[PDB]
Amino acid sequence: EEKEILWNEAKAFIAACYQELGKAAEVKDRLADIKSEIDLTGSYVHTKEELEHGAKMAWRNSNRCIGRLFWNSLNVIDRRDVRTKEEVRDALFHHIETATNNGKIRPTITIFPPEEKGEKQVEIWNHQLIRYAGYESDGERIGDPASCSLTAACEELGWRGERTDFDLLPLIFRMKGDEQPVWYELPRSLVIEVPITHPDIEAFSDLELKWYGVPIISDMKLEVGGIHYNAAPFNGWYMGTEIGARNLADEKRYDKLKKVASVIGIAADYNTDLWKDQALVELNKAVLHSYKKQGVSIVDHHTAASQFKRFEEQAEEAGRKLTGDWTWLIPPISPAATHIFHRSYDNSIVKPNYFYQDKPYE
Amino acid sequence: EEKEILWNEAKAFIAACYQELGKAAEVKDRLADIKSEIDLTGSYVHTKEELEHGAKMAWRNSNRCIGRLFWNSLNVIDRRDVRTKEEVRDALFHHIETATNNGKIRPTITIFPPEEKGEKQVEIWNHQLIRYAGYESDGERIGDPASCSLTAACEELGWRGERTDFDLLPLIFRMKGDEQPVWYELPRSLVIEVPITHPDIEAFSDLELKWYGVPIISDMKLEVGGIHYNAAPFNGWYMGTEIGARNLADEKRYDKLKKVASVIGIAADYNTDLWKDQALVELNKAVLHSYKKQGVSIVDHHTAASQFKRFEEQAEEAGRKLTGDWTWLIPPISPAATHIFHRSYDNSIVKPNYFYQDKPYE
Numbered sequence: 001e002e003k004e005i006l007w008n009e010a011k012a013f014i015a016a017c018y019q020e021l022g023k024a025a026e027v028k029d030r031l032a033d034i035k036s037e038i039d040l041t042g043s044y045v046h047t048k049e050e051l052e053h054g055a056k057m058a059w060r061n062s063n064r065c066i067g068r069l070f071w072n073s074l075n076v077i078d079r080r081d082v083r084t085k086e087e088v089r090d091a092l093f094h095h096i097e098t099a100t101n102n103g104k105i106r107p108t109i110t111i112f113p114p115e116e117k118g119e120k121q122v123e124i125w126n127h128q129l130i131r132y133a134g135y136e137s138d139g140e141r142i143g144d145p146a147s148c149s150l151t152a153a154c155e156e157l158g159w160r161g162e163r164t165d166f167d168l169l170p171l172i173f174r175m176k177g178d179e180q181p182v183w184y185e186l187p188r189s190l191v192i193e194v195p196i197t198h199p200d201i202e203a204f205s206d207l208e209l210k211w212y213g214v215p216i217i218s219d220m221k222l223e224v225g226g227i228h229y230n231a232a233p234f235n236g237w238y239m240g241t242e243i244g245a246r247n248l249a250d251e252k253r254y255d256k257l258k259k260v261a262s263v264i265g266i267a268a269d270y271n272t273d274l275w276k277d278q279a280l281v282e283l284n285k286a287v288l289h290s291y292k293k294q295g296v297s298i299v300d301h302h303t304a305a306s307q308f309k310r311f312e313e314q315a316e317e318a319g320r321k322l323t324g325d326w327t328w329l330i331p332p333i334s335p336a337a338t339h340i341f342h343r344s345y346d347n348s349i350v351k352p353n354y355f356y357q358d359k360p361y362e
Numbered sequence: 363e364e365k366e367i368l369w370n371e372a373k374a375f376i377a378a379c380y381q382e383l384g385k386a387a388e389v390k391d392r393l394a395d396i397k398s399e400i401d402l403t404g405s406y407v408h409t410k411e412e413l414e415h416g417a418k419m420a421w422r423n424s425n426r427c428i429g430r431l432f433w434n435s436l437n438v439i440d441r442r443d444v445r446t447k448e449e450v451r452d453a454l455f456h457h458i459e460t461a462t463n464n465g466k467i468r469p470t471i472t473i474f475p476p477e478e479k480g481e482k483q484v485e486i487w488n489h490q491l492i493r494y495a496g497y498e499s500d501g502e503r504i505g506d507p508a509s510c511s512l513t514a515a516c517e518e519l520g521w522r523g524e525r526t527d528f529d530l531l532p533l534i535f536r537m538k539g540d541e542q543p544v545w546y547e548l549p550r551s552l553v554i555e556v557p558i559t560h561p562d563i564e565a566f567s568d569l570e571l572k573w574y575g576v577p578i579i580s581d582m583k584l585e586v587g588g589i590h591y592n593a594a595p596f597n598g599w600y601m602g603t604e605i606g607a608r609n610l611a612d613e614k615r616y617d618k619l620k621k622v623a624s625v626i627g628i629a630a631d632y633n634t635d636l637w638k639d640q641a642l643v644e645l646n647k648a649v650l651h652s653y654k655k656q657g658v659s660i661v662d663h664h665t666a667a668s669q670f671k672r673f674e675e676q677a678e679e680a681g682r683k684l685t686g687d688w689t690w691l692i693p694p695i696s697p698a699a700t701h702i703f704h705r706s707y708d709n710s711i712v713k714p715n716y717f718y719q720d721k722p723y724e
């Protein structure tokens with residue numbers, strides 16, 4: 001069954017990929033090569049062209065992603081050659097540096113060797129390559145609650161956080177053959193962070209808020225033509241609402257709305273004053289202002305939705321079916337102000353794509 | 363097939379209704395009475411208790427409605443006795459008066475005779491009993507665009523609007539046997555309206571905005587135990603976002619955000635300033651403030667979601683499955699600030715319920 005699944009996925013991907021690349025005449029011979037390769041080895045190896053276009057198609061097929069207009073300019077780094085934990089570490093350091101690009105963020109994916117018999121070659125434990133630690137002990141909450149379990153797992157391995165609200169977690173990953181992951185502290189020179197200030201309200205800096213520049217998801221599986229790249233971290237630039245309406249605002253994250261209300265000079269006592277909504281708007285204005293002022297890439301949700309509208313138009317013009325997940329495409333601030341809110345989307349799963357996988361901690 | 367559908371729906375409804383009312387021992391005899399009644403007449407007649415509880419269950423089963431905590435206090439008015447258009451008109455005038463209750467809004471439904479062989483006895487053309495007219499001619503848009511087709515249909519029948527931005531549409535409905543609906547101007551003494559002002563910004567009144575107090579949906583079908591009450595107008599009180607984030611804000615409705623931005627003293631030039639979000643918050647604050655100041659019932663979306671959370675808890679405690687439509691339950695302002703955003707809902711259809719039906723205009 002395994003090989004049959006692989007071969008069927010392979011035929012569908014190669015046909016589609018080569019058609020898009022204008023190389024349809026080569027499909028037959030390539031498929032023959034593949035079929036024999038599967039027969040002999042139990043798997044097959046993507047050409048660099050297939051891997052690159054496959055990663056791009058996967059992004060294009062990501063139903064929940066509003067940022068898909070730019071799918072074809074994804075920067076794909078082929079690291080299927082890595083064999084050592086130093087090579088992996090250095091490839092991850094390099095991804096951060098090249099994606100960050102001094103603030104002019106480049107959407108990038110680094111692709112490590114794929115699973116073989118479902119056996120992972122490299123297993124990345126981080127949810128994002130750059131993320132803050134979280135702690136909870138004796139009623140005291142410090143840092144990002146979303147990172148509590150990973151933070152505890154790191155501290156089991158000999159790492160120790162300073163217990164600031166913004167401790168950078170180390171990179172942590174496990175190699176095939178090793179029982180325990182290794183961890184490496186992030187060189188701070190690699191990590192751009194942005195202090196949050198407000199364009200009009202000087203007191204906003206009193207909150208001492210900041211966030212990191214580049215979100216780099218490192219725990220999803222890239223699937224291309226039946227091959228499972230469980231380790232393939234990717235990044236874009238932030239949409240401001242992710243920081244201002246979720247990371248800093250959610251009660252189960254940094255939970256800052258009451259403190260925001262206070263610094264902007266409004267009462268936080270009555271639902272009918274809409275103080276939470278007002279605080280959310282000002283926090284989200286501060287986030288965009290701060291990233292722009294520092295020269296770090298960011299997009300606001302209105303511009304992002306406008307770009308997504310163009311992605312819809314491009315899909316129809318290219319004769320491709322559009323798929324989307326309305327519940328994730330609408331922004332968490334003023335969603336009815338975007339065209340997304342007012343239409344529906346087919347939530348069908350198309351491959352290549354990115355998929356969740358089980359955490360090795362928890 | 364018709365009678366079989368009716369009989370099956372009847373058995374399911376009577377069993378459930380009588381169980382909830384603690385009258386399960388009476389189910390068998392009542393069902394016998396019903397089965398014979400269907401045999402002889404082709405239909406059956408609800409007792410006043412069944413009709414009342416059926417209307418309440420229907421509201422309780424309305425997946426898209428955040429206001430369902432109060433389903434059991436719905437005020438049901440049985441008008442299955444009406445036969446003349448004057449009786450219908452007067453029943454609709456009465457609904458407005460009793461539901462309005464001098465501003466202390468009472469959720470109310472008035473139930474007219476049901477369809478017989480799919481033949482309607484009374485056909486109400488209004489979408490809501492109280493709504494503003496809309497006009498479009500030679501590039502000029504006046505009033506509420508959502509009412510353009512109904513307004514044109516009214517003016518075909520001899521009505522003429524003053525072409526203000528807030529013309530009250532007449533009541534319009536058709537009786538069985540008549541080819542044309544009749545229309546009746548609404549007595550203004552029956553209609554409470556609220557001028558929109560802002561608690562802090564005096565200039566807000568310069569926009570000369572207002573809205574009506576009571577939303578009374580009059581074009582949905584109530585279905586109870588296989589009986590189709592196509593004419594059964596119902597009302598609640600508004601959630602403020604319906605007025606401030608949709609009716610006055612949508613580009614295809616009153617489209618006021620640019621004018622709001624100007625009166626609150628902010629630029630409306632850059633997406634990254636989040637001027638639309640800021641305008642939406644202030645407009646929505648003004649709406650709540652204005653209804654409260656005038657003593658007209660209204661709920662803000664935070665309080666409404668808190669009530670809905672209690673509805674969820676009540677459902678589990680009563681051993682009833684909960685159904686909901688996430689896409690409609692989340693408010694259009696700060697949805698992630700509500701618990702609704704962070705969970706999922708089973709969107710299954712349970713009867714009794716309210717259903718869309720074809721418009722007789724358009």
Ligand code: HEM
Binds near residue numbers: 066074108237
């Ligand atoms: C260029 C800037 C980008 C922006 C602003 C953006 C924005 C977003 C947002 C807001 C989400 C919603 C998920 C959440 O909030 O937790 C999302 C989902 C997603 N994005 Fe993007 N994205 C971008 C680039 C990328 C890239 C480069 C990839 C991969 C190559 C990608 C793949 C995805 C995937 C797979 C999801 C769904 C994750 C899930 O199911 O939980 N995005 N994106």
Ligand code: HEM
Binds near residue numbers: 427599600
């Ligand atoms: C008491 C105050 C009430 C509030 C604040 C409320 C709020 C809402 C809101 C915001 C919607 C979303 C639909 C839209 O925005 O267009 C809705 C849907 C609905 N409500 Fe309520 N509601 C209330 C009372 C009632 C009552 C009394 C009934 C019937 C007895 C009812 C039946 C429904 C139905 C059937 C829908 C779905 C309509 C559709 O599918 O388009 N509601 N409600």
Ligand SMILES: CNCCN(C)c1cccc(CCc2cc(C)cc(N)n2)n1
Binds near residue numbers: 217237238
């Ligand atoms: C619902 N999403 C769960 C968390 N995961 C797996 C996830 C996956 C993709 C994107 C996100 C949001 C963080 C993010 C990532 C990227 C690549 C870009 C961006 N603007 N924001 N999160």
Ligand SMILES: CNCCN(C)c1cccc(CCc2cc(C)cc(N)n2)n1
Binds near residue numbers: 579582
């Ligand atoms: C998506 N809804 C389409 C318009 N319809 C049919 C509809 C039906 C029920 C409720 C609404 C919103 C207006 C309304 C009605 C009622 C009874 C209460 C309320 N707060 N708001 N609209």
Ligand SMILES: [Cl-]
Binds near residue numbers: 215242247
């Ligand atoms: Cl994030």
Ligand SMILES: [Cl-]
Binds near residue numbers: 577609
């Ligand atoms: Cl309305």
